Amino acid sequence: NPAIKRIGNHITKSPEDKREYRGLELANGIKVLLISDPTTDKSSAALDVHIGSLSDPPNIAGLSHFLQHMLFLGTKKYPKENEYSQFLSEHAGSSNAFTSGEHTNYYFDVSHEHLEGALDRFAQFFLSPLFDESAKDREVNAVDSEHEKNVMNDAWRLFQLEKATGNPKHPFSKFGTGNKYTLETRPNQEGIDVRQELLKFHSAYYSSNLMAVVVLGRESLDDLTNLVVKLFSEVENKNVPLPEFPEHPFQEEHLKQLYKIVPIKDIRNLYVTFPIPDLQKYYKSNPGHYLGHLIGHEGPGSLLSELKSKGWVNTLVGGQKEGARGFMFFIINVDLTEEGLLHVEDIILHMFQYIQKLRAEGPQEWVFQELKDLNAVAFRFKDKERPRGYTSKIAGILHYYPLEEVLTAEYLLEEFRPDLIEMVLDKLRPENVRVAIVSKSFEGKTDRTEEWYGTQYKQEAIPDEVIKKWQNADLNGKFKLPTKNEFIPTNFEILPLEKEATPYPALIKDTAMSKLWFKQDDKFFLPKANLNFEFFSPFAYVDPLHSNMAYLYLELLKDSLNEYAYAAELAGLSYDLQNTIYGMYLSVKGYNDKQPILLKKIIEKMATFEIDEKRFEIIKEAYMRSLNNFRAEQPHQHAMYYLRLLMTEVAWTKDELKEALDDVTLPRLKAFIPQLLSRLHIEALLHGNITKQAALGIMQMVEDTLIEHAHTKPLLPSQLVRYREVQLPDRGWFVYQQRNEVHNNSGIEIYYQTDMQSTSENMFLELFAQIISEPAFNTLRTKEQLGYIVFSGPRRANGIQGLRFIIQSEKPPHYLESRVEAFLITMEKSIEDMTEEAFQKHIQALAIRRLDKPKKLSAESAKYWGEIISQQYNFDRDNTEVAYLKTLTKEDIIKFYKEMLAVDAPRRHKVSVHVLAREMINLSQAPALPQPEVIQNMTEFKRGLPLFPLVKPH
Numbered sequence: 001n002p003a004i005k006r007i008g009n010h011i012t013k014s015p016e017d018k019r020e021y022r023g024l025e026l027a028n029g030i031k032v033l034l035i036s037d038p039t040t041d042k043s044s045a046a047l048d049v050h051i052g053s054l055s056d057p058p059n060i061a062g063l064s065h066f067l068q069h070m071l072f073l074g075t076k077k078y079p080k081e082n083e084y085s086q087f088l089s090e091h092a093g094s095s096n097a098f099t100s101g102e103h104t105n106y107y108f109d110v111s112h113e114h115l116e117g118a119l120d121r122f123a124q125f126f127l128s129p130l131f132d133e134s135a136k137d138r139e140v141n142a143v144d145s146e147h148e149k150n151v152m153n154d155a156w157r158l159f160q161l162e163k164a165t166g167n168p169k170h171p172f173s174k175f176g177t178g179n180k181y182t183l184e185t186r187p188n189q190e191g192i193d194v195r196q197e198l199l200k201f202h203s204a205y206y207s208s209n210l211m212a213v214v215v216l217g218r219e220s221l222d223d224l225t226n227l228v229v230k231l232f233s234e235v236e237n238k239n240v241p242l243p244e245f246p247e248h249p250f251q252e253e254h255l256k257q258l259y260k261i262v263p264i265k266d267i268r269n270l271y272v273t274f275p276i277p278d279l280q281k282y283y284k285s286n287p288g289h290y291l292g293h294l295i296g297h298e299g300p301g302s303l304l305s306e307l308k309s310k311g312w313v314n315t316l317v318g319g320q321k322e323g324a325r326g327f328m329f330f331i332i333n334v335d336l337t338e339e340g341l342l343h344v345e346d347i348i349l350h351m352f353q354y355i356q357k358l359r360a361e362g363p364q365e366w367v368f369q370e371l372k373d374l375n376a377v378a379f380r381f382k383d384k385e386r387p388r389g390y391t392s393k394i395a396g397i398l399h400y401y402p403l404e405e406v407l408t409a410e411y412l413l414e415e416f417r418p419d420l421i422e423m424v425l426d427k428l429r430p431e432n433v434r435v436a437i438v439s440k441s442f443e444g445k446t447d448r449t450e451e452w453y454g455t456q457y458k459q460e461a462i463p464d465e466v467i468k469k470w471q472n473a474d475l476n477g478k479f480k481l482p483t484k485n486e487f488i489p490t491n492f493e494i495l496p497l498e499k500e501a502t503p504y505p506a507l508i509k510d511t512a513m514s515k516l517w518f519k520q521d522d523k524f525f526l527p528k529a530n531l532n533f534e535f536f537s538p539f540a541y542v543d544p545l546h547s548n549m550a551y552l553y554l555e556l557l558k559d560s561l562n563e564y565a566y567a568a569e570l571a572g573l574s575y576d577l578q579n580t581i582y583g584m585y586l587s588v589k590g591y592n593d594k595q596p597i598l599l600k601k602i603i604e605k606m607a608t609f610e611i612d613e614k615r616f617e618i619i620k621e622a623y624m625r626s627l628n629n630f631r632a633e634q635p636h637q638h639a640m641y642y643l644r645l646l647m648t649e650v651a652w653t654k655d656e657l658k659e660a661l662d663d664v665t666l667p668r669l670k671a672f673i674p675q676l677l678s679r680l681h682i683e684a685l686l687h688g689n690i691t692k693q694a695a696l697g698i699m700q701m702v703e704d705t706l707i708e709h710a711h712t713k714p715l716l717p718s719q720l721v722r723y724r725e726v727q728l729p730d731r732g733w734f735v736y737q738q739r740n741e742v743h744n745n746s747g748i749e750i751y752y753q754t755d756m757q758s759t760s761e762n763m764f765l766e767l768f769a770q771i772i773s774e775p776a777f778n779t780l781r782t783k784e785q786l787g788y789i790v791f792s793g794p795r796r797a798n799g800i801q802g803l804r805f806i807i808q809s810e811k812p813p814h815y816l817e818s819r820v821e822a823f824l825i826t827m828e829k830s831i832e833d834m835t836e837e838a839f840q841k842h843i844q845a846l847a848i849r850r851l852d853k854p855k856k857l858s859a860e861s862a863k864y865w866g867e868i869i870s871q872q873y874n875f876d877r878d879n880t881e882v883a884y885l886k887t888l889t890k891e892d893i894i895k896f897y898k899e900m901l902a903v904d905a906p907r908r909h910k911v912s913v914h915v916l917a918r919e920m921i922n923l924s925q926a927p928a929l930p931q932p933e934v935i936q937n938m939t940e941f942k943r944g945l946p947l948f949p950l951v952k953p954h
């Protein structure tokens with residue numbers, strides 16, 4: 001075969017991985033991985049081009065990102081602007097892409113029966129894209145919103161600020177997103193033909209030698225091979241040299257520098273950065289991760305422990321951070337308490353003290369050995385990935401590793417390299433340090449402005465006196481290396497499937513205190529389990545004050561277990577613990593071996609909790625800011641939030657919570673906890689590598705612990721009250737209007753309430769949503785370009801449902817309203833004009849999506865958990881609902897549109913949330929809308945309306 005340059009030897013995989021693999025290099029240089037999974041419901045492909053933003057023309061920032069957007073909008077073989085989206089949508093698929101500095105990564109999934117058609121359309125992106133003039137003029141606005149959305153976001157600002165403070169000559173300094181100015185206005189002004197620059201760029205850099213492809217399907221490896229050779233060997237090889245960046249963006253003049261930065265949110269952070277060489281080639285020893293593991297440790301003896309005890313920091317991140325081919329960074333990032341903010345010099349001294357400890361002890365093979373063993377176990381028992389993410393991830397790493405090692409390369413450690421460890425450790429020195437402090441206290445004291453985001457900051461030399469103090473850091477006896485991790489699992493035995501084992505969770509305990517749902521894993525056979533618990537107390541959400549206290553309690557509890565639980569975390573045993581409107585939620589996930597130990601500790605801790613006053617005051621202060629910082633969330637997020645407040649029976653606002661927070665004292669909190677625990681109901685799902693007897697024991701152990709230490713008594717069934725959704729009146733339209741003070745975009749959510757969830761009402765809604773899904777995106781974004789964010793689909797809450805539209809835009813909400821209304825009328829015509837085959841395609845597409853099997857335990861657990869917390873308990877829901885779905889007709893959907901959704905629908909139930917921005921033809925005809933009732937007060941609104949029933953259990 002002349003189209004294939006070489007075929008891969010065995011691709012190393014986990015012995016638990018039933019998927020089949022073959023690696024190839026095509027004659028044109030494309031590295032390929034083929035994955036055969038005859039069980040998969042969705043097939044997938046991805047292609048990664050080893051070119052990105054760092055290669056943008058200096059005079060056209062964002063070109064490669066723009067290019068990425070434009071490949072979706074038509075090729076020579078498939079010139080219809082949305083043929084790709086529409087094909088994927090009509091075949092249960094989805095696509096996306098991303099542009100980073102050195103990569104452009106495209107990926108899709110689709111129903112397994114339609115891989116070839118999806119893959120063919122896809123391949124044309126890399127052969128002959130149209131870069132249509134009309135589409136270019138429109139899509140540039142979507143890139144502009146993407147950017148607009150990021151501008152007042154603290155992370156993006158910091159991201160670009162770093163680039164702005166290094167060598168300006170370095171490609172690292174480039175603005176990667178682009179916007180209307182960089183991609184249209186300035187280029188027109190400078191006489192540039194952007195369509196030619198896209199063609200020029202595609203031609204020069206989209207070369208086969210820089211591409212890697214991954215394809216996953218039901219087909220055999222042989223069949224997948226022919227397929228890929230067929231569609232991809234015509235991609236042209238231009239032998240483009242791979243861009244490299246051997247010169248660090250941070251040279252001498254950029255070291256021993258301090259940056260004082262004003263955030264948008266009220267946050268307090270410190271970023272310590274060291275420039276380091278490119279460690280990528282050392283992947284078999286991974287010295288930077290060895291050091292990140294230690295410097296970032298959260299257990300006893302760690303840097304974070306001492307910083308916490310001193311009341312200076314709460315969280316810490318440490319380790320290596322990617323740059324590009326040629327350079328990397330090493331970082332230590334902490335948040336700051338109000339004291340911490342006054343002690344940055346000391347915090348940083350402690351950092352250099354801990355680093356000095358590492359020099360003193362030298363490289364530790366036992367530490368390396370441990371990281372190795374953990375990674376080995378993690379790889380062996382890796383959860384089976386969803387195809388779309390998997391092809392994308394592997395396509396990226398086909399560029400860095402031999403074909404035979406792509407699956408293992410990022411997991412298995414091979415080499416102990418004390419030499420490389422000392423080499424990197426030698427870079428972590430004060431003379432090589434960069435320091436950034438983010439705090440509102442710098443407000444008004446800054447003299448520089450980063451140009452792309454507007455970030456206010458100040459730059460100073462770190463004084464030599466301060467550098468010297470850091471350089472002479474003695475050994476602090478508070479810092480000890482971590483000890484052996486006792487949570488490392490050793491028992492991976494898969495218990496044989498019991499005789500009375502069930503396909504769905506079975507109710508195996510139904511007492512006044514406990515409802516225990518159980519299922520032994522019959523699918524995945526990895527030594528793991530998920531243990532989920534809902535704790536109900538009417539006292540977790542009875543008022544704002546108690547809602548605050550439930551939160552602080554659990555935050556305090558997690559803060560207190562952190563040192564102990566960290567070992568468990570590294571050993572693949574994690575837990576999740578948060579307060580809810582009904583109670584408390586606890587999830588323990590991971591290797592089942594040491595699980596009961598961690599679970600017992602959490603419950604013991606809950607029931608015998610002693611609060612540290614210093615920890616209390618600090619966490620309370622952070623929570624204060626956290627509530628306040630909601631003002632800086634995105635407009636569309638505000639819209640969703642306000643709607644959730646409006647449609648739920650009981651809901652405390654951020655203002656209400658914040659106001660009540662000043663009244664939370666230590667005495668009150670101490671009194672609250674035993675009250676909260678005094679009466680409970682526990683509903684649990686125990687699912688995985690466990691038996692009925694172990695499950696009964698785990699459950700009973702949780703109860704017995706609560707009973708012994710907290711004297712927990714049962715709740716009454718009548719107390720187990722779920723909240724209802726507000727029942728909107730026939731033909732009603734309500735508008736609630738608010739302003740976002742931070743962002744200069746508007747947000748809108750439109751909710752067309754339909755009826756109670758129900759087999760029939762569920763599938764009417766879901767099928768209509770399926771049909772309008774792609775056209776809504778194509779119409780409201782691609783054509784009309786209202787915003788980057790355009791979403792439509794079902795909304796489900798409290799047993800009720802309806803259709804929702806969410807948009808974030810530069811246009812005012814009342815304008816968005818008419819365009820969404822104009823769009824609905826178009827869909828009605830579209831359903832009338834659509835063929836029977838086209839209609840059945842949509843039924844078939846939704847069917848595939850609903851019946852898509854979970855590939856890992858947690859995904860299956862999640863399905864059940866939904867059935868359980870919604871109190872609907874409909875475990876066979878998918879087969880049932882798909883069967884009903886298949887009997888539906890074009891006529892049925894049209895009747896449902898006319899009765900519930902159309903503008904003059906007799907049972908239209910419409911509520912709109914308008915979030916105004918900070919400073920506030922060729923188009924289809926929008927219908928005239930009625931005068932809306934403007935909601936002035938959320939409480940009056942709820943009082944004046946009925947409440948829906950709750951859904952009856954299955």
Ligand SMILES: [Zn+2]
Pocket residue numbers: 065069143146
């Ligand atoms: Zn984008």
